[PDB]
Amino acid sequence: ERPFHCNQCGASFTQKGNLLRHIKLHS
Amino acid sequence: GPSTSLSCKQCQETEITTKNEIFSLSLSGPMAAYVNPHGYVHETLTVYKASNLNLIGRPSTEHSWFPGYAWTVAQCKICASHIGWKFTATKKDMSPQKFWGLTRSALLPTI
Ligand SMILES: O=C1CC[C@H](N2Cc3cc(-c4cc(CN5CCCC5)c5cc[nH]c5n4)ccc3C2=O)C(=O)N1
Ligand SMILES: [Zn+2]
Ligand SMILES: [Zn+2]
């Protein structure tokens, strides 16, 4: 259900698009 | 002892915990550097209670820094910045049953 994972914190997402935004926000 | 607040560094609009919540879970003092599976290093401070955080996803024991505990990602309720993880015991015999590990770079003041 949440296969996409943030490599900095472990946050998981259903939508890879939301992952991408989340990763950007770590900067 | 110190009892003032630690706030979200990114938004500075919410208090997350206070210094009187800080405790040492292990030999490595209340704050130490931990390495995540991808080579990101988090100076993680352990506190009993935190507020103004929202949880993302489900608990996981994967690569847990605190054996016997599962993590859940925690973010600032206002700005969604990553602040740390909630840790929850996977067995009854453990004390505390839950605590928070907060990443130093997400917090003001700088511990
Ligand atoms: O005590 C702690 C606090 C949390 C902290 N963690 C865990 C972590 C995990 C992952 C992670 C997870 C998965 C999903 N799994 C794959 C195989 C079973 C399911 C994938 C899949 C692709 N990449 C992934 N990355 C990324 C970052 C972080 C992180 O900071 C830590 O190390 N220890
Ligand atoms: Zn992340
Ligand atoms: Zn914030």
Domains and CATH numbers, chain A: 1-27 (3.30.160.60)
CA distance B5 to chain A (A): 23
Mutation target for A interface from B35, B40, B103: give the one with most A CBs within 10 A.
Answer: B40
Task: Judge contact between B13 and B78, C-beta under 8 A.
Answer: yes
In chain A, what residues touch B40 (CB-CB under 8 Å)?
7-9
- The dihedral built from the CA positions of residue B67, B73, B74 and B75, taken in this order, carries a sign that is positive
Per the structure block, which two tokens stand in for B103? 């990443």
Resolution for the entry shown, Å: 1.9
Residue with tokens 């979200």: B8
Residue with tokens 């996409």: A4
Domains annotated for chain B, with CATH where assigned, are: 5-108 (2.170.150.20)
Per the structure block, which two tokens stand in for B67? 């054996």
A9 inside 8 A of chain B by CB: yes
Tell me which long-range contacts B82-88 makes (C-beta under 8 A, separation of at least 24).
Answer: B82/A8, B82/A9, B82/A11, B82/A26, B82/B106, B83/B8, B83/B16, B83/B50, B83/B53, B83/B107, B84/B44, B84/B50, B84/B53, B85/A9, B85/A10, B86/B50, B86/B53, B86/B55, B87/B46, B88/B59
Residue with tokens 């210094």: B19
CA dihedral angle for residue B66, residue A7, residue A12, residue B28, rounded to 10 degrees: 20
